[PDB]
């Protein structure tokens, strides 16, 4: 009767817990991480590094279902080798091998970034070539393959998504590749321009805060009667910066936007420009809500609210 | 100055380490595993899972290289996953981290294993779908990504190559699936029948393990401006046990199989029927020597003197 | 019997590892560091494993441990808390271990334990110790443990706090008193140097074969001679403008420019000369090497190198 | 205060040079030779040019010359009066400059001071001397002058024969001990050597430190302890088989071949073995070094 | 075909040049020396000067050098440089011409090779040599090189070492053995004597004759009988009261007195008696003068002179 | 700009050569001998090896050799062969070398030059001189060719005739004016003195500050100013009694006893006093010291010195 969320306090988490809670009673979901809220009143420390910590939290609270946010993202990946291998590696492992013991459910979500230069670049399918270029991604297809073995080995319910960039209006930008898409909204706000680093037409495939909440649901919420796989594919849209840029012009006419590349170009030509998640649509029902022009609008009115 | 062996006492390190000593003198490899070499004369004991340990022989031996062959194979994989992915996972990233504290280049193997029952069969490309079902697999694909990020990330020279299934008179068969090729030989010099635990037309690659020294020391002196990948596949020739069968009565008749296929056959089935390895013909010139009935005729004869 | 360098590889190391091969023969000096010399008896030891040392100090019969294992004043305030790990826990197994096993110790000190409320010119061996670095604070501890070991367990522990120390060998590499190395390898492969520190930050400072019979001869002292565990030893201060000057007697065409940056804050917390009086009195150290010497000498190597 | 050397530059010379440095400062030492080292203080003295001698004795402060100058057994057989010129005087000039100067010296012998009327079992420092070579003989020479002028007029002269002596410095060129040298590069860049001398040929031989050792221990020794002026030195003998078979215990593939030539009949009527129980006991002369570790150290500083 | 003798006008030279040219004829002998006789053949030659020696040997046909020229033990203390250079480079220039032209030499050596070392009775041959003098060490020289040349050159090179030489002829030049032709003038002159040597200092000595005879037996010897190139040769060996006491078996009267100074610790250092057997057996040598008929003979042929 | 003085180590020279580095500077003088100061710019040079002069001459910048180098009269009379070779030898080479290298030359005679011929009281500049001993009569020579390079090839040669000089520095050694160095050595050493010249031998003295001034005043002076080459130069004349009264009245206890050796004989033939009249007229010389005043001054600083 128990969810408990590791890395519940990240960009995702902080509107991931409270959306559960919503869902399920505040009291059946246990918050935990390494870093407090920026309220709450059911949190826990817990480094995923830490394997009896874990076994801790699950006995002590009634855990049946993990849902793993915990991870080190792009950019720390890029910064600091070893460290982002081994909280990203030892937390899925630590995670899987608790399941298995205590027989839990698991979620963990994954990544576009899985995805490299031979990966097929448009409408890219969930069984595909997968030889990504950062650690983030590497530490990912490991994610992916451990959790499916876990599955298949111990009948772990192991479950996840890759998730395209996510926008969100709570969570303040942490330098990685997709946040410029959201970096965009508060200088929009704050000087009416911004300077993007990524080339004008690099298209990606990003997705707002509520249908990321709803895919995370949707999934995890699946009977597993009718799942063909372990890991979705999901998308709302692509988009380049410069269609993001004219969808803000469209309700903000005067914004303006510069362009000065830096090495976070060379990691997003190397992602999908788009994501084939036909699988999702069939196998449970996965339908996105946002599209660009109102994600845009509704970012708009709560970050203007946002100050 | 001198090379690392890591795992040396395998079935591929107790002839690679000869051999190596006869391409560059016999105090110029350290010979390093967790069991002796059942002299050698320049042993010593590593545990790949402990950094420090390796750093010690690194520096104290004068490495610039390390061929590590150091892994728990598919049998001990599945009998206890955990371990598997703590010496394999452990091992390799503790390889890599000290080749680039110390700079040193490095040869891992990883295996044809790494693919799954989406994986193309026939023909296998270098760049693929890669989704294996075997934990001993799934620690292979982190070999070949975290060695190819180093590469890219750091300059290590990282190179890698996908044996196939490898045969010797040598090193004593153990519960692998493509070691039914191994014990086919023992069983035919001494009942002059075997069971086999693959059905009759389980297509694997093999290769005999002249050619496995052969490919490993090709690779490994290859120089570095020829080589478009890190990892590559290898392959001599393919076939069924039928085949390996026929080909043994062709120089001893009276040879009889018969096939009681156990889970090593859900094993075999998801792997390829034939690996492509052009590119490592175009690359770095690699040419096999021995097809089936020349290891045969040579095994034979080498197993009737070793009784 | 033997004896245990440890970081035996650094600047320092590399040049006092051979020098006591030579007083006390070659298989009598271990040397070991975490990263093989750029040896005969070579061992991998870092200082942070105090178990790895019981193995070294047991099976080569050690009987001294020359503790030079220590991260530096760039690396200190770069990554602080492995300075402080490195430095301390070295200390402590060191000291830990010459308890256990009655061993004697050699601990470098270093100029960068003093701070900017000790007095600057001609700093006494007994003053206010306040240091700015995570590098200073970090050998205060080294003294003051060393000397607590002597006092109570009778560890004959002994250290020299060294002042800047120059040489030809050992690449520079981003310390405060690391300018006195850079302007020579810039002076013959350019005829120039932009220095780091302001023309006129005094430091003490002093020359390898200096700084090598230094150690050599507090190591060698009898121990009813100090009336201290702890000396400072200087040969010479300077500023850079003395250096750039001492440089020109020889090669007139070499000039300077001055682009200060970070070094030059660490710098003006040091001490400008040294009172080493207690080491002269003590043991009869004495320095061969002033400034012109030290320099002439300095270029002469460096252009047989290159 | 103030050392010169003469022969600084030769096989002894380049490793007592430094040793002297060490032990006394850079500047004490006047490094002096005909050729230049292979410094600091470096000058040109050819011995046989008395008062140039004079002119670097006066204003280089010298209170003691070091005079190793000397043409050695194998220049001594192939040129006998060029060897005569310059070690007899040689000798002549450092003694006549000592007396007028009050200087010390030091100047080496040799075992082959001795010859085939020498008892050559453990040879004692007073005993039959007939040499067979123009080395030999102009060394004795040297000691009895170096005595006469101890016992004429005071000046504190002393002397050590030196055993062959091997290093890893200066590199061979001929002596008949010299085979102890030959035979390591021969064995690190070959596995094999031919030795020239018989097989059996046993003499008394000292490792270069112990050598270094031996001469400032005389040099050092107070005047008073000092029974006679020149005292026979040495570590260990051996025969060219014996160091074969030490070389073998690091090296077991090393190989050996006899082909002796005119040196053998030269180290015959050398000692087997010499007596320096004389030097044991007036100025504590003990050598550190047997057979078995200078060949490991050869090995180790040539490999190197 | 010719001989020359150098040294010729010395002691043993005055006598031995006559005697030569009566067993050879008178212009068979190039008589030659720096100073001249008290002659015909007679030329300077100084024996330091090599190229004159060069002359005389070609000019006058010369294939024998007996070689005498030296300044003895009185002259050696005294001066003892040049007595380095006329005895060392004399021996040397003449072996060097005995090579070139291919000569014989005779080349006196002495009983002060001999030291304190050296057992003093019935010295042999072959012994150790450790002389305390200017003149034995550098006889020694003389002995090591002739034989050096001979073994090496094929020069066929031979000494005798003489004991303390008695004539009549020479005026005594204040050597140590001398004393043995003073106390004859003085006999003569006076009934009285004083010795500079101890009144028991045994030296072995020779008459003149005795001298000549060995010179000219170890010079005609046939090559292949000489088993060595130096021979010990004596006659007697006596004390100065021995010898007190032959006088006073003619000369009564005859009184001494002994007053020692500097010549008593030279004659202490050497032989008191030599063994010459080896020559006796080689080349069949054979004193005929005994003390008291060199006594008898010395004093009849002085009181001939006076 | 360089003075090279030979016979820089002697009794005046040890003196002459720091006076002229005062004047001069350190690094303007070239101090050289054939032995070393009892410095920091000697150099050795034997005067009798021309060529070695020319090398100090050509090397140094020299233009001004003060030649003080010779034997003295003791020497001279104990070893006159080799007395000849270096004073007219020496000579010689320098005057050739300042011909060749156009260089000044200055080199002193002495009052020995005259002999028992030569008027004795105030004896003229140019007047007889027959020397009797080897010393003077080499100085003759000195003189005669000094003037003759002078006349001959404009090489400005200058010489003074010291009479016996007296000072603290350099200890006596065995010439005839030298009783009066010895004196005060013995007076205050045993407060007493034996003299080896008679009583009553007058002859002419010269404290060493005004034989430095002498020697400067000369080699100052302008060329035109000089009517003559060498100068009688002078301050006192004395007899050993006069210096004994003198000494007395500082140290009345003082005693003198007298035993005449060869030294009065050779007193005998020089002169008494000298007429230095001519050095007065042309350079100005005065002498500051009289008998009392060097007497007090020697006494005093030979005290502080033992
Ligand atoms: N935001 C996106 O665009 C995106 C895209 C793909 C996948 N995801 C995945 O969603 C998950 C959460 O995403 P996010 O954007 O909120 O990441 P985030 O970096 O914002 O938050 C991750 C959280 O994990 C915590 N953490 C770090 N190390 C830890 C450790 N050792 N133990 C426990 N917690 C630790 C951090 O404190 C942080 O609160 C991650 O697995 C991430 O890969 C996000
Ligand atoms: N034989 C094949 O058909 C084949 C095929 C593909 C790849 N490979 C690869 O070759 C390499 C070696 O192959 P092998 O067949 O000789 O395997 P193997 O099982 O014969 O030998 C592996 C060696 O590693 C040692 N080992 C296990 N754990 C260790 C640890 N923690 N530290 C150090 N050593 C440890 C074992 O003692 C053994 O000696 C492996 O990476 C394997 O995946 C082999
Ligand atoms: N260079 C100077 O001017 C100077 C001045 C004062 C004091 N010192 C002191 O002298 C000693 C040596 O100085 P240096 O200049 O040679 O320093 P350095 O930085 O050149 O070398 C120090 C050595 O320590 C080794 N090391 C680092 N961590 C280690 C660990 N955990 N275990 C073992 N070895 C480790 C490094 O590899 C290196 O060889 C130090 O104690 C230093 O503080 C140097
Ligand atoms: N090496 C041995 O085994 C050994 C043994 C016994 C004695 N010694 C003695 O030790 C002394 C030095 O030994 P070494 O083996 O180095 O001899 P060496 O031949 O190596 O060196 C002698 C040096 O003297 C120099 N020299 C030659 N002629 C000279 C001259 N006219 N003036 C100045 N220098 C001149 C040579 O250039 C040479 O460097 C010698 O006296 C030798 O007799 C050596």
């Not at 459910?105 to 448009?122: C, K, M």
Request: charged fraction near 20%; include cysteine; proline fraction near 6%.
């Amino acid at each position: 009767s128990r969810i408990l969320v590791t890395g519940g306090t990240g960009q995702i988490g902080m509107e991931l817990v409270p959306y559960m809670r919503q869902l399920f009673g505040a009291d059946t979901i246990v918050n935990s991480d390494i870093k407090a809220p920026g309220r709450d009143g059911n949190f826990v420390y817990c480094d995923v590094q830490d394997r009896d910590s874990m076994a801790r939290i699950v006995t002590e609270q009634g855990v049946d279902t993990i849902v793993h946010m915990a991870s080190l993202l792009s950019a720390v990946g890029e910064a600091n080798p070893s460290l982002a291998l081994s909280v990203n590696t030892r937390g899925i492992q630590n995670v899987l091998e608790l399941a298995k013991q205590y027989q839990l459910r698991v979620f963990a979500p994954s990544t576009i970034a899985v995805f490299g230069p031979s990966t097929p670049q448009d409408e890219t399918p969930d069984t595909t070539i997968m030889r990504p270029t950062t650690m983030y991604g590497l530490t990912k297809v490991h994610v992916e393959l451990l959790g499916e073995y876990y599955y298949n080995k111990f009948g772990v319910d192991f479950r996840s998504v890759r998730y395209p960039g996510v926008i969100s209006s709570e969570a303040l930008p942490g330098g990685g590749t997709t946040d410029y898409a959201v970096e965009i909204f508060y200088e929009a706000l704050k000087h009416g321009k911004y300077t993007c680093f990524l080339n004008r037409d690099a298209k990606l495939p990003m997705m707002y805060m509520p249908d990321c909440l709803k895919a995370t649901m949707g999934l995890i919420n699946a009977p597993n009667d009718c799942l063909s796989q372990r890991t979705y594919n999901i998308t709302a849209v692509s988009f380049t910066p410069e269609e993001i840029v004219a969808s803000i012009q469209k309700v903000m006419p005067s914004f303006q936007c510069d362009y000065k590349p830096d090495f976070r170009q060379q990691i997003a030509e190397t992602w999908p420009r788009s994501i084939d998640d036909s699988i999702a649509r069939k196998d449970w029902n996965w339908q996105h809500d946002f599209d660009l022009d109102s994600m845009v609008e509704d970012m708009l009115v709560k970050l203007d609210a946002k100050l």
